[PDB]
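dumping this here so i dont lose it again. seq + smiles for zinc ion
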Amino acid sequence: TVAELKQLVARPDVVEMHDVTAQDPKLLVHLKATRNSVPVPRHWCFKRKYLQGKRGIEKPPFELPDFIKRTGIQEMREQKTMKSKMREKVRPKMGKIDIDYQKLHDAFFKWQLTIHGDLYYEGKEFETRKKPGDLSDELRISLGMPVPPPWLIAMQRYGPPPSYPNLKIPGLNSPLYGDVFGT
Amino acid sequence: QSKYIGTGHADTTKWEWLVNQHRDSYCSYMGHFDLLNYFAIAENESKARVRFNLMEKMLQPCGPPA
Amino acid sequence: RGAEYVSAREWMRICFELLELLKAHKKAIRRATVNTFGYIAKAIGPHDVLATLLNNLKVQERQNRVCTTVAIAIVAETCSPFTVLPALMNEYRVPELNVQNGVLKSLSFLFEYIGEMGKDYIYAVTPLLEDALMDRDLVHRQTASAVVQHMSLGVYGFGCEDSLNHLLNYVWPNVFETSPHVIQAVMGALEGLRVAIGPCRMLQYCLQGLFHPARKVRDVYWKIYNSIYIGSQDALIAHYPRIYNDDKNTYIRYELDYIL
Amino acid sequence: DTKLLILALERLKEAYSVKSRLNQSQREELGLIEQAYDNPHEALSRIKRHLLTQRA
Amino acid sequence: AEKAKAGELKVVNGAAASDQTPGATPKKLSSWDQAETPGHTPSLRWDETPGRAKGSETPGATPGSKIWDPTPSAETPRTDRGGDSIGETPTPGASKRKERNRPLSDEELDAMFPEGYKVLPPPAGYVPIRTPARKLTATPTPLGGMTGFHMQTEMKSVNDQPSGNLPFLKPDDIQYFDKLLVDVDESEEQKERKIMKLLLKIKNGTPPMRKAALRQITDKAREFGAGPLFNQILPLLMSPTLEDQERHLLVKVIDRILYKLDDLVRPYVHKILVVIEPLLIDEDYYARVEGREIISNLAKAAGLATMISTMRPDIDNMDEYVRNTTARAFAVVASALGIPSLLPFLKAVCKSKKSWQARHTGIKIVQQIAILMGCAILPHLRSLVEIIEHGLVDEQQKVRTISALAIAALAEAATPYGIESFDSVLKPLWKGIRQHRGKGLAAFLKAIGYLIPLMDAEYANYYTREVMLILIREFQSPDEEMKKIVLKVVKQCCGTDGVEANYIKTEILPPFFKHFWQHRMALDRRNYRQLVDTTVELANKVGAAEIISRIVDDLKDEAEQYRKMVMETIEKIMGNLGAADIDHKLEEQLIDGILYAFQEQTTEDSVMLNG
Amino acid sequence: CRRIVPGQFLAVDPKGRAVMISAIEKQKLVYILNRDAAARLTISSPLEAHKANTLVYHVVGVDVGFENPMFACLEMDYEEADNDPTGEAAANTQQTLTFYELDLGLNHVVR
Amino acid sequence: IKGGVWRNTEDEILKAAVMKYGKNQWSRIASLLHRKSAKQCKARWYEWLDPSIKKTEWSREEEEKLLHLAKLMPTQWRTIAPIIGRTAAQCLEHYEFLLDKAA
Amino acid sequence: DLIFCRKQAGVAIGRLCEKCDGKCVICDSYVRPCTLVRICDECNYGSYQGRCVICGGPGVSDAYYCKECTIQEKDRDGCPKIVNLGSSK
RNA sequence: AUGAUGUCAUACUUAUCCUGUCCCUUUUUUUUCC
Ligand SMILES: [Zn+2]
Ligand SMILES: [Zn+2]
Ligand SMILES: [Zn+2]
């Protein structure tokens, strides 16, 4: 029974819907809760083959690490008629980049993620790491408060939110630095 | 893979997997002089008698199957 | 050998003529071609000629593009890649996809040839692999994974494992697919990651998948667990967790609990 | 039948016998006639099919 | 166990009841040499050999009497071959008493044509015309007749293969693919045969059609089953007009479908091999490696007992062709399932007392196993020898010849090891070396030849010195088989470290260059190569300047191939021994020879240049 | 240190002809030794004693003067124990002493 | 070798190309497509893709007119086709359809 | 159709022809030749003396393994002389 | 809101391919004469 099977585990929450159909649940219960091991990715039982292009069409093409940006190659790379291309062979010009071998002997020495407890899955990008108590900069600007966000003054009167019951927000039951006024 | 002992597959049982890791642990014990000596220290026996009891426990461990 | 007797202008013309020799139907032709291209890369120096490689239209498949990629590798060796990388990494920006996966290959062969020297550049390539390994289309995951492989063999033992773990995160979801090239790619990937990271972390990702109810997950995680199992079977001993003993069987190994 | 088809094909080949690089359409003609040598019965059946049908 | 002898009389009685087949009986008894080991496996194998029904009856009664005695101390298939040989004796006999045109019977008539056709009389009268037709083929041909045409003005139906595309049909292939031509469509099995014409897409069409078709039929294997496929294939692969490519492609589809189907093919195994065994003997090499591959996949795919019980009746078949190619078949299947599994079968065969042809076959099987397995024979070499040894003394000749030949192949794959395993074989062989005329002699020389490198330089001293005489005398035979054998022999005997130079220099070299160096040899291929090798080794012993010095003058000979031969010979020689031994004048003749020969080149080749 | 990989137990012939190496399970290999033309030691190609599911307690060289060498392998089979749910094969199973015979002429190792 | 079956991609690209460049430049349009020549592009336009071509069932009048004319000028399809306002291949197919369904 | 023979690895040195000369066998690569190839005389014998490990031509050189297959320890398995799934000749 | 069935179609992958290769198919009623 999926009911009583939940009494045999320190963290029975690990047991799930299809878990009761396992060939050896009396073990998998004890494995899945192993100390430092990580969960199985969730993209199965979703038939979508692990990705679609919905959220992936709004992403930037790429952005360089700051160590590579300060170098100055970015502006050097940027157009040509065909006969100019056969002229570019007959004419040819040398040294368009003309990089500083001192600079590219400098950056990656002189100048120059996630822990193990995380794993990526399909749709996850920003959300988990905007929460009750955590907001973005600009919307601070529209709000215009100098370094609580002021409707956590009314989270005093009307009470802690039904939606996020576990809530703590600064100064009330949560005894705050920078942006993040609640956890 | 098959002819390489310890090879697993989707139908692998608990009992077989754990008796595998047992036997492999025992081959490690036979292997490393020190850890063996640690065992001899803790429970007082000869190096010999230790290795002998292990070689007895090679086929059995966990006991009968299911 | 000599290479001084001829002025540079002649050389760069030789380059722009060499570029289309890569249509050869023969492999040895391309061989000598790429090696020469490296030699003249030494005769001149990197930036111009690697730019002339990045000019490539990518127009046909293999038969070949990826030979130009190999030229990017060997060129990156002939003078220090310690110079060259920013140009390439910038050239992943371009919206044209096949050349994006092209420069991914360039990183792959690149680390394959540089070996130890990747103890630094790992960091530089790490976020880009993040962008690539996060999938636009399968070839990204594949090629990027190959990069993770050769990087993973190359850097071994030098203490950079952390970022390789981070990249292993993004590697890990790709485990599931039926496409032969991406699955064998991922296999090579997780093998190199096995040796570099050490088995313990691997196994800590491979535990729960063994007994999972579904057949798929068991097929795969058991394939992986076998790959982890054959090599380094000696070192696995410590990392098998504690598993409680049932009625008919004693699943606790008490030897490890003997305390002086 | 093979006799006839052979003769006609040779005749067609005779116009191009000097064979400079010619052009595209001519290239199609040489390649197609050349095809007719390898698999004659195919060509004969296709021909009789035209003769029985196509009016345009 | 003497009641396994009298018990062999008992088993002979029972199995004989359930007549006269020696093989199955010795296969049964063949489990005795393991005694107390024998087990339920004997029920499995024999299950296929006799009826699987009686199989449980006989094996069960055998274990009872066996266990008790210890304490107290396909048939239709073979029935067809017997009738086949008996009709051969009837017809052959009649002529003494006195082909495909022999008159036929209505059951035989119903045998050829496939399903769904009717026999017609139109009249009884037109039938009487058909009966007088014979008499009137002479009579009415001698009578008035002619044809004419009138000028008058003049519908034309016909069928290619239309649907959408249907790549073209050769004018003959219609017979096979006619069912596709009719356009009746969309109304069970008839639709599976009808859709199975995707074969046609594999045979003829564009390369993409062949690819996609090939996959589509691969994934439908489990669906359609082996029966319909082979039923619709084997005629094509049997076609008299078959191409090279088309053949190879049908071979491919047979492979790819046989990677899947395993238990299914059991009824069709023979029905496959009959077409496939001709692939093993072929001029094309790639055809041969393919054939060996697909028979490997078939035998391993099917069961051992399936193969064995299948292939027996081809052993005694009248034609030797099927016997031979069948021997190579057993070679392939034995490479598949291993020597020890198949041993008792063979060891039973070579002792068969019925007729010699069988033993000839089985021995040939020993050989082709020797060639195929080669170096890997090593473990069972002893048992194999113990089998073959009994044929050397047999009254029939062939069996002796092919036997000793098989010893040769063994020893050649036995390169030096296992000398004592050949041990008991020797003493007869040497004796035979004295008394034989003709091909068998040469064969013995082949065997002994490959043996000598495996002996001890002391025993082989004597024995060798004995062989040298006959070896000398026999240079002169016109037989080219002879010359091949004695050639390679001279290599091994005289390339022995325990042989003295001067003796060769005197006795051998003059006849050697006399008879062996001639324009009969060089034009042939194998004789060319082997000659090159042997001469190279003689140089390796007696030294350089001798051989070269005698063959230089032939650089200037007219024909090419001969010049090519001596040229590559000089090449290898000066490659190994080094040019230091060469004197001055002979060196002038060298350089001039090499330039001169090089100045006339009919073909482009490396031999002259590398030379 | 492995389960199936040799190097564990080590034995050698009194005449030094062939050295036998063995693991704990499944793999027992033999290297044959002969001095070269200069009487300097040359090692042969390996051989294979492989026997499935067989534990090797100890391996000791055996003395046969100028013979086909012998080897004493202590063995036991657990395949009886794995297929016996009762646990009878845990008892009533005696370790098999087997002498392998190397054979130079046949150049393999037969039980 | 160039010849083959027409593809929706090639056919739509042919639509766009004809729209942009104009009717009289064929070599320019054949340049964009692969495995097709200029003649084939032109005849493919005027035979089928051309919007002025009428693709639909034949009315009774068109059948009367087609049959009458075909009995008037036997086997001449390129003369008749403009008179009835249909493509030569089309009115051919329809004629063999009228004799086919007529018996 | 084409797969390893995987017979026990002997002391015989590997032999590659013109074509295969530079390739590390398993990784298919030309990079970092380091260690040496060993195959059994069961795979290498006779007409196979100095034969290519692959195509069946005369060996002009000896195969060297990469460093990649070195650390992954694949060079220690059965003799990597490819056999076609017919015979080897 | 991506299941199944279709011989539509296009991209793409594998430093795969394109030059290697003929060598044991030699099978027959034994039959080379100072
Ligand atoms: Zn081998
Ligand atoms: Zn090769
Ligand atoms: Zn490698």
